[PDB]
Amino acid sequence: LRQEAEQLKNQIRDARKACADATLSQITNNIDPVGRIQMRTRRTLRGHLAKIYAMHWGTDSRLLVSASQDGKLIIWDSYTTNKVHAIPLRSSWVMTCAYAPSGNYVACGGLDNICSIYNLKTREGNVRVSRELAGHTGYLSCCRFLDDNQIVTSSGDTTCALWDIETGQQTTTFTGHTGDVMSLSLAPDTRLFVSGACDASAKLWDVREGMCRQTFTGHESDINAICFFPNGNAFATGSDDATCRLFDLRADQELMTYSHDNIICGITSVSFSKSGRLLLAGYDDFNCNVWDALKADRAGVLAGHDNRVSCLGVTDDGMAVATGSWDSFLKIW
Amino acid sequence: TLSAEDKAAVERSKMIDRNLREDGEKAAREVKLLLLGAGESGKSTIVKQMKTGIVETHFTFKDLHFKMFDVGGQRSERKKWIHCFEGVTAIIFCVALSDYDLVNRMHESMKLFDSICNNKWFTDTSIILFLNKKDLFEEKIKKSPLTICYPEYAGSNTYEEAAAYIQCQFEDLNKRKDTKEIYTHFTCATDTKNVQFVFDAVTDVIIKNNLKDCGLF
């Protein structure tokens, strides 16, 4: 019964502790610190008139898409600041968006419980909603594209789903979280994905089968952001306890914790650099931090946002970092 | 420096900016209300009088456009999406008077209202409080006195005194009385007067905000 569970939890904790021979801090203590990092506001995307909750970079590292309470997504050309597209939304309460890896579709969702997909390369010229993906019974946290046909989705229904856009329904529902799931991160090979939830747990899911491959705990509050390491064998979570963490899929435990006494504020977004050396965590203290992922030392600070930094992204070629904040302005560094 | 296609792209961006500015002005002229309450608190009746997930009810009164956001379909954690409603100019909190004699839900309304009125996000948003199902209360108080709901009640078992005690409890649950205010009201099973009260509360909030911008409040 439940005592058997408890015994299994004790056994798995003992196995993790036995396998944790050393720590990332002492393993990478000898490496040269990256030094101070200075990041100027290379571009300032302005035109949003309400708090920005999400953005996603295109696969070409030039276009991006941002969602806010304006009731409309905006597709920006980050190189020249031009607004490529402005897609009016059916619901103004949008807290997620994604840009398809092929660049053809753009998804967005929120309190409407629907991850709507919009077609960008239509023949008529105006972006139109191709599908209205409904079936979640709670607010929508983050829906991420797999390809032009499949899309994983994380909602407050305590479950993550894998919808097929062509038919419009779920083909695999990932259940097992206790509370609201607020984050997603597809593996670079797109075969597994980690979802962080409000029960202070991040679960490694396998899309092909559907079972919860692994679970990772250690946070002391709700998890707000998650992002795979570029290698695809690790992932960093950012929660409300003002601590980031870097868990390993193969070791099935954390390796480093990113925290400081000065920061007593939760993490609203987490992303990695192209090489995985830098961990850019956008906090709710109106700013972002840049952590040496191998040393847990704050390698830089990104200030300039008048409000909470809600969304953060790093270009696929690592050339720039774009942070969107509640002050309705995106900043590309 | 910019070729023909780049110039036309910049022109398209400027047109998009114009449309975005127009839409933003139109949306800023709107009045945003957040509707809250219990499942059997009569919010369905109230929205019927003015007319899956969130429910938007749009209506117009005295050339003012009100959008009521009902979040009754959200069963997740309140704090995880309550920060989205910072900009609402008022919170229409509906509480049923029939909740005092049917089970524990009166304490549920107490705690929900306390949390709503003590959120860090809603520290400056006025709460328009509606007392719904008052006609049934007026005759069922004699059958079930308010002392059953709260033994600490000390007064005549009349509907007027019970209503006064309720609107004293709700206001005592407030903690930010100096910044925000609770505009309590009784539905009286009518629509026009309810909407008129809502409009009065909204315009009072607007004038208070203008005095705040002036420096007076």
Epitope: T80, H85, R123, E124 | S3, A4, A8, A9
Partner: single-chain antibody, 229 residues
Amino acid sequence: QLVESGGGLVQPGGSRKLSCSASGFAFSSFGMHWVRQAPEKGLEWVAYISSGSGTIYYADTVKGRFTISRDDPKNTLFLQMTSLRSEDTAMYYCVRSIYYYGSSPFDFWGQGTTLTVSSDIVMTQATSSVPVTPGESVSISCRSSKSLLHSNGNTYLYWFLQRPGQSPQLLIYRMSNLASGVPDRFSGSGSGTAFTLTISRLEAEDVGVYYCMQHLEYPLTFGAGTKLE
């Protein structure tokens, strides 16, 4: 679906109104052009109006004699011609074009309407006729006076294919990209000055005249045209 009207016989020195009715796309966000083709010569750009009518351009040969206007609520593009010359006789094509990042300008061309009357970058396409057989590759060469490789990396050169008795269609945009729905056979290549269009596994549907246009700056000038048969 663009269809034009208002052509026909006109006395020289007169005036005529050409109406382009559009149906099936967002006319408001689409820039429109007007490209005329002589009864025997190649295409020649005539007029251009942007989205919202904020920007208007004309060919320097006919500057000020034509007036191009838009009616988005009516969804119709008008072109008023005054004081026609005998050389003005041509078939006019209403050409859609939307400009943003990654868009495909000049993608859809109207059916065109005929009209008979009693420092610019010059593009050379001297290979006038190429005798070809089905199933064999072919290469068409175009040359520009000024390099089209702009400082932002875009090489503004378009390849159009006009079938005998059919309106021209966009074939390749920006010297590399393939227009939507075009067979994968076609490829574009070349430096900023000399450009090549290569067709592999040629079939009968490839018979026609190929034109190279430059979109680096106005006026837009087409090539002489290469005829394949």
